[PDB]
Design a binder for this molecule. Structure first.
Ligand SMILES: Cc1cccc(C(=O)N2CCC(C(N)=O)CC2)c1
Length: 185
């Protein structure tokens, strides 16, 4: 792809994080902690899942960023509406304000309703995310495989400002402790 020139510097918003997440000093990395991380609760925090938002809000233009997923067993990545539900159980779908892909149990799926099987020959270590607000597009690229296309959501109805979206996953197995990292420009 040729989207690299729309690169944006994303940082994580601590206030939105599940209370078990550890966000680095530079706000560019996040991982699951092994306990509650000693923060106060607030209405922004994702309660049920190890999720966090980027600080940046997008309402126009073209944006691109990259995330390192090396050696993780499970994660979700993409964008979401600023007003998505934070508390309780919910599915990742465009109807609920999410445009995402994930890894779970050795398969990659797009967060459509119902979910769509992805066809990835080279397991990615870094993912590129492209948003074209005006066109209503969210695309995902396999940086490990020369930028090959993973998935495009088109005809998106964003219906609000967008925020970068992250889920480090569940780490019941002891094999999913590694961080998500925002990769440098
Ligand atoms: C619902 C939810 C929210 C946040 C984190 C998790 C999670 O993956 N673990 C890893 C395993 C750990 C444990 N077994 O003590 C409990 C936290 C689950």
């Amino acid at each position: 792809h040729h989207h690299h020139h729309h690169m944006v510097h994303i940082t994580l918003d601590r206030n939105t994080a599940n209370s078990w997440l550890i966000i680095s000093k530079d706000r560019r990395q996040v991982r699951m902690g092994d306990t509650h991380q000693n923060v106060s609760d607030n209405k922004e925090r994702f309660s049920n899942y190890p999720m966090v938002l980027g600080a940046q809000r997008f309402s126009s233009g073209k944006m691109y960023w990259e995330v390192d997923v090396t050696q993780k067993e499970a994660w979700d990545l993409g964008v979401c509406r600023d007003s998505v539900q934070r508390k309780g159980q919910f599915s990742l779908s465009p109807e609920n304000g999410f445009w995402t892909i994930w890894l779970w149990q050795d398969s990659y799926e797009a967060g459509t309703s119902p979910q769509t099987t992805l066809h990835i020959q080279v397991p990615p270590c870094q993912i590129g995310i492209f948003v074209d607000y005006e066109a209503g597009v969210v695309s995902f690229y396999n940086i490990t495989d020369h930028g090959s296309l993973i998935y495009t959501f088109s005809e998106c109805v964003f219906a609000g400002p967008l925020r970068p979206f992250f889920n480090v996953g569940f780490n019941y197995s002891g094999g999913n402790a590694a961080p998500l990292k925002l990769c440098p420009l």
